[PDB]
């Protein structure tokens, strides 16, 4: 029953193409993160999970394929973090299931083969987007990593690359899981894929929400009004990502350092 995989030739050409496209962006992100992170500790190492949405909403071309933008972003971020040599980098996929595409202990993203084997596993066809399961599994993964670490403190970070679309009733369901992550000092940052080439009316910033009162009069809200992740950034262009992710982490560390 194993998941359908891209051709390896396709995945290798994607990795190589995306690496070329993003090389200057990764350099800018690495430079900024080194200053942010290689202060405030790194005697500290990190563990970072890049969590990529594998659901079929990422294939909608009314939203200019968020999945394209997510895999470009994945290559950019994985390469920027690899040159820092500050800790371990893993990759999770999620949709109806949650899977480990690349373990924290797997080879580093210094080889095309390692990156290509990751891209092979993302096809953007899963029939649901189970963010509650993602958070439960990510918390449990990082908690096992802590227990392993004691028995033998890391800074543990999850970056979620996703179009950010779940049923609005799930926003309330995600809040207790985010509290549980925060209690365990797991930092969760959401990277919303919202390609500028989305058709008019179909951007995440344009998505509306109908609430019907007792009288039956509909009151209009905006989808992100209740978005439960306190730390996120919206990417409309691949080039947006380094400046925005660095600014978010720089500001958070400025505040936690007081």
């Amino acid at each position: 029953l194993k998941r359908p995989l891209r051709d390896y030739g396709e995945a290798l050409e994607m990795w190589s193409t995306f690496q070329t496209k993003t090389q200057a962006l990764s350099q800018s992100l690495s430079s900024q993160l080194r200053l942010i992170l290689t202060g405030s500790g790194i005697k500290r190492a990190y563990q970072i999970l890049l969590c990529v949405d594998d659901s079929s909403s990422m294939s909608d071309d009314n939203r200019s394929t968020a999945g394209n933008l997510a895999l470009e972003s994945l290559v950019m971020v994985a390469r920027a973090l690899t040159v820092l040599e500050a800790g371990q980098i893993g990759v999770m996929g999620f949709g109806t299931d949650v899977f480990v595409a690349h373990a924290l202990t797997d080879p580093p993203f210094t080889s095309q083969d390692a990156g290509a084997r990751v891209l092979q596993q993302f096809t953007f066809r899963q029939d649901s987007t189970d963010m509650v399961l993602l958070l439960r599994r990510t918390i449990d993964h990082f908690r096992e990593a802590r227990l392993i670490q004691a028995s033998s403190d890391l800074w543990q970070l999850a970056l979620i690359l996703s179009d950010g679309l779940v049923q609005s009733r799930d926003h309330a369901r995600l809040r207790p899981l985010l509290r549980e992550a925060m209690e365990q000092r797991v930092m969760v940052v959401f990277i919303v894929m919202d390609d500028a080439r989305s058709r008019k009316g179909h951007s995440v910033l344009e998505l509306k929400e109908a609430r019907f009162g007792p009288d039956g009069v509909p009151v209009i809200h905006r989808y992100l009004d209740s978005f439960p992740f306190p730390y996120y950034l919206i990417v409309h262009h691949l080039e947006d990502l380094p400046g925005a992710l660095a600014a978010l982490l720089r500001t958070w560390f400025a505040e936690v350092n007081s």
């Binding site: 509306k208 929400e209 019907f212 509909p218």
Partner: protein, 101 residues
């Protein structure tokens, strides 16, 4: 609302008889998805004043098939699932709006 019986929601795309999109995409709870509620919703998204509402009927486009359903179901969630749309929120549902008067 409660875990055991909440029906969830879907995203609606409203197009007119020329096929042109009429509003932003909008999220609708299945527990609200009567044809009359959706008609009032479309008029509200167009900003029309309450006594200016055009009553609408809607034809449902089934995702993944070239199939349009002209009579509005008693249960929209069940209709979509019967046609193989197992999780409607994952894909936007196009509704053709038909001004009645």
């Amino acid at each position: 609302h409660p875990m055991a019986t909440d029906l969830g929601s879907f995203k609606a795309n409203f197009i007119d008889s020329d096929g042109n999109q009429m509003t932003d995409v909008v999220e609708i709870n299945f527990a609200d998805a009567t044809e009359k509620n959706i008609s009032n919703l479309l008029n509200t998204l167009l900003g029309r004043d309450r006594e200016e509402f055009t009553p609408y009927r809607f034809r449902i486009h089934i995702p993944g098939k070239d199939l349009i359903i002209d009579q509005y179901p008693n249960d929209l969630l069940s209709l979509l699932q019967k046609h193989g749309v197992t999780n409607p929120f994952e894909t936007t549902i196009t509704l053709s709006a038909e001004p009645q008067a």
